[PDB]
Amino acid sequence: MPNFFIDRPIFAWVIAIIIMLAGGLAILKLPVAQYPTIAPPAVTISASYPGADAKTVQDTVTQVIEQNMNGIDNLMYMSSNSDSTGTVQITLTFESGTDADIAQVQVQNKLQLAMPLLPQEVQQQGVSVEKSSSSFLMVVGVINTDGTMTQEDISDYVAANMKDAISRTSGVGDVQLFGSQYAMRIWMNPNELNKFQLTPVDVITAIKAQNAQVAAGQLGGTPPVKGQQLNASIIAQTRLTSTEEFGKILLKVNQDGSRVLLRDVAKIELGGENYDIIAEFNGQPASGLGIKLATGANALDTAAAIRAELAKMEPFFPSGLKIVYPYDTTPFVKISIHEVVKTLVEAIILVFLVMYLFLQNFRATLIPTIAVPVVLLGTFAVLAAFGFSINTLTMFGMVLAIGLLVDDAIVVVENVERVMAEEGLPPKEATRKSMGQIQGALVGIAMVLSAVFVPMAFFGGSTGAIYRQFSITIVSAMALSVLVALILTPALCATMLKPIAKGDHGEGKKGFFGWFNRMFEKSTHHYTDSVGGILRSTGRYLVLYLIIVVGMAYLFVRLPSSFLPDEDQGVFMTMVQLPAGATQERTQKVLNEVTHYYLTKEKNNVESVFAVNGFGFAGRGQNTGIAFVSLKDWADRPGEENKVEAITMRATRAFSQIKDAMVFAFNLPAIVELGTATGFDFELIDQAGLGHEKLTQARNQLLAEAAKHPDMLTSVRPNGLEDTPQFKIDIDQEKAQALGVSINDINTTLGAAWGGSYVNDFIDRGRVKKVYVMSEAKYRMLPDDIGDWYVRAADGQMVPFSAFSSSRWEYGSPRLERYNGLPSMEILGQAAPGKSTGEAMELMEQLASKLPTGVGYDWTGMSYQERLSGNQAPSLYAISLIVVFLCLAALYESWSIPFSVMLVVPLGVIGALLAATFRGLTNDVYFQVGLLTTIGLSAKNAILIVEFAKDLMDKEGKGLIEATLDAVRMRLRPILMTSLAFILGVMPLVISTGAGSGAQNAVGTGVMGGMVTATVLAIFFVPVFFVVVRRRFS
Amino acid sequence: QMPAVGVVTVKTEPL
Amino acid sequence: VTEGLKAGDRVVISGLQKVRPGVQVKAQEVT
Amino acid sequence: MLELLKSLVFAVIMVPVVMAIILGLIYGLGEVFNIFSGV
């Protein structure tokens, strides 16, 4: 094949042009996103039961939903969260790889069969299914800087004149609103209701009757009488469209003209649907929008379009409004693209410089510069054809594979140049001989790299996708590079080389070149005689090999393991949990204190604090609170003392003094879609039907037991809310009936006075909005106030609510959790800074084994993924080992020679482990990928050396020692050149300061250690293995 | 370290 | 409160979450 | 421009020193292996 294309340079040029065109077309159209679909598909069902405690929502709503959601295939695990506010959330997480667009239909259809089995209020509110594993492209906050608009006004303005336009641009998927639009609130007044002899049911009936739409029909009906010529539409009563119209609703009119109006008994205003969440941006009331990227869309273009559309609206922005972007993900993608371009340019310049330094010929230097971009475009085209995207992992694989492309180019060019120098033949025949000698080795190493990288893509779960991106990119790059080396490069060696005379290797000239050649030749002679001397003996270095092996094993065992390193994303969360029974006022005070601290003592680091009151990751309620703190750009935060870790450590140290609140601060995981906390999630599940008190006592005992080992477990905290006092009202049914009061009236009054009822819909400024009915604050705020409400009996008299009702106190849980259909509770927390996660998991399992009988344990979230390393058992590494053994035995006919090649594998793993231990990084996915790359490079060097030695031994009559020494003398310049190129090209990865530098640091350190140690300890060791294998198996 | 608490003083008064 | 509390007693108002029975604490009056 | 110039100068001052260390390990390993081989 290579000699075939040598005589036809333009055939190779045509193939290159086709590949370049394919790469350009691929780069023209390709989705761009921060991360691929890494998290497993998840569907969340949300339902609302206004003014209902946790128990009512749990038994009457989510029980029926959970019962009727059985039979869904590919279901991994289900969780359920009820609340005292009245919201229930059921999250179903499926297996990885399934089509979510069908699972959503399945769960929705199964839910629609249980709709008539739910109470009426939840049906009127409505339930909604959605996909929670989508991640937020950006959040757009809108704030008021004068004090006119409130949260409700801002939310309605966004819902009316911002949501549609922002949703109707290009590339935008789901758009979520963090507020609620307007709603006509009707605040009763018990004094006025008693004055006119009315009850809330009368107001509800009047609103239902006087705020309806009637199908009037049509003038000149559908069957017309003979001789009709007029036809029109009749417009009868319609929905009320203003507060002044709602205030004129009649409630009681006598025959003499006396009337009672709704405004005479209640206050009508325009408010929100629920006053449960208060959002303040830097101390000002604010609302927000969440924009998610649609599938198969460009992130940067969508962001630019969103920014332009938002900047269009300022002339029409009313009053004082400001638009801010607390959190967006585009800078990471821009940084990734910039790093890719920088690495490509640096590699090209570096390889040109090193080729000029060594080969001294410009025509030799120019050959790879017109070959590496061809392979890059081919990789782009193949990756586009397969169905991948431009993530932050594929480009990392490309910057990793640049070294492989450079290695192939260096090998081919150096071999042809040395053949020409030592043979005297001109470029044509020298290229023919070199290609004929090296084609088998090239095919063998391509097959070896494919065999070592493909099985990594067969992992399951999130790790499966993370490995899949790198594996696909690497194998595509290797295949394209070897195809290019077979087709395009031999033509280049045929045409663009100068046939210089033998012996003119720069020794005829002085300066840097001749002198450098002098020490290079002297060092080559020294190395050759040294390796000959060491090869004279065999058993002296077997003990060194065993020492290296045992040291590598000890380092592998000692090195801690984790899942994925933390990164400085510029955003971190702060959580506030007040004691049980705390109201909104104290939470607002604590949030104000936190905001003041952040904006006063960290002015040079933070940029804005988006405080949210009433909602927390643990559980919604008037007891918790959250705050998303965003930092300035990484350019303005120099040093390691101004990163996320130091900032959050100082923040929690300072917040430890905040009384009446346990304020914590933490950093969100690098992949935001998978989980919300950086630590493991552990779940205790009741099985023997103990109840709730036993479960709580067991959880407290386990927490105390785990807190007694402050060496591997840190920040072990519950994820729920503790039990709270509750008010119990008991109505004397027979007393109420005796007095003449119907039970229905009492129940309706109690449910519409303190809980609030949703009655009808109305048209406001050209849109549909609900109307809500509830008492006016001061009459529903203390227990004694329950005596202020009056109910009409049959006789027409009004009886007070305190004449037939009592009251008492109780204890109840404000948040009930369920896992897989059983009551359960969750403990979430990280591990020690100096130990592996798996050891903490094992110790937590051992601690849970000591629990009282009847309580089981389980994992969820990333922990479950960490428990999916059963495929990471040697059952897969061994498969790869046998596959590469078979490939090596097939490349050259021997069942024993590949042992020498495999013996070089530990010599790079030892260096990778040394670098990891020196830097202190843990064993994670990126380090594993770098280790595999180093193993592949060492195997490539071993393949080249062994193949050259075997060819010299077989084709000619050279003896074992003589052929081995000649081969190792011959394969010295390419190895050193490739090692120098790789080591110098991976400098920025190790030296990277910030901007998502954790993965870069880990991979660069692993690559540096592996490459340096393999280059140092392979030239001296591979010949020993070769000669030992040949003599022992002679 | 030593935990600290904010406490109120109980004294009778007519209302 | 009708019974249980006497004149001059001290009742914690803040720091309840971070405190536990039978622990020495620094008590300060708040306004 | 400035970034391109700094990248070039950094590359050309870092290649020769790195090649120097690599030849240093070559020399050191060769000598120690020669010493140990003859016991």
PDB file of N, CA and C in Angstrom, chain A residues 917-947:
ATOM      1  N   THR A 917       1.699  10.700  43.527  1.00  0.00           N
ATOM      2  CA  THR A 917       2.038  10.776  44.944  1.00  0.00           C
ATOM      3  C   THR A 917       2.750  12.081  45.274  1.00  0.00           C
ATOM      4  N   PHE A 918       3.634  12.541  44.384  1.00  0.00           N
ATOM      5  CA  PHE A 918       4.328  13.803  44.618  1.00  0.00           C
ATOM      6  C   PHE A 918       3.345  14.966  44.658  1.00  0.00           C
ATOM      7  N   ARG A 919       2.439  15.032  43.681  1.00  0.00           N
ATOM      8  CA  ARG A 919       1.444  16.097  43.673  1.00  0.00           C
ATOM      9  C   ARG A 919       0.309  15.845  44.657  1.00  0.00           C
ATOM     10  N   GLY A 920       0.108  14.599  45.080  1.00  0.00           N
ATOM     11  CA  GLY A 920      -0.934  14.284  46.036  1.00  0.00           C
ATOM     12  C   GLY A 920      -2.308  14.063  45.448  1.00  0.00           C
ATOM     13  N   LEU A 921      -2.440  14.064  44.125  1.00  0.00           N
ATOM     14  CA  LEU A 921      -3.735  13.853  43.498  1.00  0.00           C
ATOM     15  C   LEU A 921      -4.222  12.425  43.722  1.00  0.00           C
ATOM     16  N   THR A 922      -5.541  12.270  43.756  1.00  0.00           N
ATOM     17  CA  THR A 922      -6.165  10.977  43.981  1.00  0.00           C
ATOM     18  C   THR A 922      -6.331  10.220  42.666  1.00  0.00           C
ATOM     19  N   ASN A 923      -6.643   8.932  42.787  1.00  0.00           N
ATOM     20  CA  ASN A 923      -6.863   8.071  41.629  1.00  0.00           C
ATOM     21  C   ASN A 923      -8.294   8.259  41.140  1.00  0.00           C
ATOM     22  N   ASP A 924      -8.449   8.875  39.970  1.00  0.00           N
ATOM     23  CA  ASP A 924      -9.764   9.208  39.437  1.00  0.00           C
ATOM     24  C   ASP A 924      -9.792   8.862  37.951  1.00  0.00           C
ATOM     25  N   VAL A 925     -10.841   9.326  37.269  1.00  0.00           N
ATOM     26  CA  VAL A 925     -11.056   8.963  35.871  1.00  0.00           C
ATOM     27  C   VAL A 925      -9.982   9.575  34.980  1.00  0.00           C
ATOM     28  N   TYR A 926      -9.699  10.866  35.170  1.00  0.00           N
ATOM     29  CA  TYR A 926      -8.716  11.542  34.328  1.00  0.00           C
ATOM     30  C   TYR A 926      -7.330  10.936  34.507  1.00  0.00           C
ATOM     31  N   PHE A 927      -6.959  10.629  35.752  1.00  0.00           N
ATOM     32  CA  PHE A 927      -5.681   9.976  36.002  1.00  0.00           C
ATOM     33  C   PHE A 927      -5.632   8.603  35.346  1.00  0.00           C
ATOM     34  N   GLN A 928      -6.748   7.871  35.373  1.00  0.00           N
ATOM     35  CA  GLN A 928      -6.796   6.565  34.723  1.00  0.00           C
ATOM     36  C   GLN A 928      -6.590   6.690  33.217  1.00  0.00           C
ATOM     37  N   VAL A 929      -7.227   7.685  32.596  1.00  0.00           N
ATOM     38  CA  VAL A 929      -7.065   7.893  31.158  1.00  0.00           C
ATOM     39  C   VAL A 929      -5.618   8.244  30.830  1.00  0.00           C
ATOM     40  N   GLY A 930      -5.014   9.135  31.621  1.00  0.00           N
ATOM     41  CA  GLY A 930      -3.615   9.468  31.403  1.00  0.00           C
ATOM     42  C   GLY A 930      -2.698   8.270  31.568  1.00  0.00           C
ATOM     43  N   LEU A 931      -2.985   7.423  32.559  1.00  0.00           N
ATOM     44  CA  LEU A 931      -2.200   6.212  32.761  1.00  0.00           C
ATOM     45  C   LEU A 931      -2.309   5.282  31.561  1.00  0.00           C
ATOM     46  N   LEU A 932      -3.519   5.131  31.018  1.00  0.00           N
ATOM     47  CA  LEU A 932      -3.693   4.300  29.831  1.00  0.00           C
ATOM     48  C   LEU A 932      -2.920   4.866  28.645  1.00  0.00           C
ATOM     49  N   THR A 933      -2.924   6.192  28.491  1.00  0.00           N
ATOM     50  CA  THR A 933      -2.169   6.810  27.402  1.00  0.00           C
ATOM     51  C   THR A 933      -0.670   6.563  27.553  1.00  0.00           C
ATOM     52  N   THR A 934      -0.150   6.699  28.775  1.00  0.00           N
ATOM     53  CA  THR A 934       1.268   6.432  29.006  1.00  0.00           C
ATOM     54  C   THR A 934       1.607   4.973  28.724  1.00  0.00           C
ATOM     55  N   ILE A 935       0.725   4.057  29.133  1.00  0.00           N
ATOM     56  CA  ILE A 935       0.924   2.641  28.840  1.00  0.00           C
ATOM     57  C   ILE A 935       0.985   2.419  27.336  1.00  0.00           C
ATOM     58  N   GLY A 936       0.079   3.056  26.593  1.00  0.00           N
ATOM     59  CA  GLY A 936       0.090   2.917  25.146  1.00  0.00           C
ATOM     60  C   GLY A 936       1.367   3.435  24.512  1.00  0.00           C
ATOM     61  N   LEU A 937       1.863   4.579  24.987  1.00  0.00           N
ATOM     62  CA  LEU A 937       3.099   5.130  24.430  1.00  0.00           C
ATOM     63  C   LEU A 937       4.294   4.221  24.708  1.00  0.00           C
ATOM     64  N   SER A 938       4.402   3.717  25.941  1.00  0.00           N
ATOM     65  CA  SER A 938       5.483   2.790  26.256  1.00  0.00           C
ATOM     66  C   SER A 938       5.384   1.523  25.417  1.00  0.00           C
ATOM     67  N   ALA A 939       4.166   1.012  25.225  1.00  0.00           N
ATOM     68  CA  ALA A 939       3.978  -0.155  24.374  1.00  0.00           C
ATOM     69  C   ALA A 939       4.389   0.139  22.938  1.00  0.00           C
ATOM     70  N   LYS A 940       4.118   1.352  22.451  1.00  0.00           N
ATOM     71  CA  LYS A 940       4.524   1.711  21.095  1.00  0.00           C
ATOM     72  C   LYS A 940       6.040   1.693  20.950  1.00  0.00           C
ATOM     73  N   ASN A 941       6.747   2.282  21.916  1.00  0.00           N
ATOM     74  CA  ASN A 941       8.207   2.262  21.856  1.00  0.00           C
ATOM     75  C   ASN A 941       8.737   0.832  21.896  1.00  0.00           C
ATOM     76  N   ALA A 942       8.163   0.000  22.771  1.00  0.00           N
ATOM     77  CA  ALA A 942       8.579  -1.397  22.845  1.00  0.00           C
ATOM     78  C   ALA A 942       8.318  -2.124  21.532  1.00  0.00           C
ATOM     79  N   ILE A 943       7.168  -1.863  20.906  1.00  0.00           N
ATOM     80  CA  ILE A 943       6.837  -2.498  19.633  1.00  0.00           C
ATOM     81  C   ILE A 943       7.864  -2.131  18.575  1.00  0.00           C
ATOM     82  N   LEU A 944       8.196  -0.843  18.476  1.00  0.00           N
ATOM     83  CA  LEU A 944       9.159  -0.420  17.463  1.00  0.00           C
ATOM     84  C   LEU A 944      10.512  -1.088  17.682  1.00  0.00           C
ATOM     85  N   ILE A 945      10.998  -1.080  18.928  1.00  0.00           N
ATOM     86  CA  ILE A 945      12.314  -1.656  19.207  1.00  0.00           C
ATOM     87  C   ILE A 945      12.319  -3.152  18.907  1.00  0.00           C
ATOM     88  N   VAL A 946      11.294  -3.866  19.378  1.00  0.00           N
ATOM     89  CA  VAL A 946      11.245  -5.314  19.204  1.00  0.00           C
ATOM     90  C   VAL A 946      11.125  -5.676  17.730  1.00  0.00           C
ATOM     91  N   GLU A 947      10.298  -4.942  16.980  1.00  0.00           N
ATOM     92  CA  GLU A 947      10.136  -5.237  15.562  1.00  0.00           C
ATOM     93  C   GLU A 947      11.429  -5.001  14.796  1.00  0.00           C
TER      94      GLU A 947
END
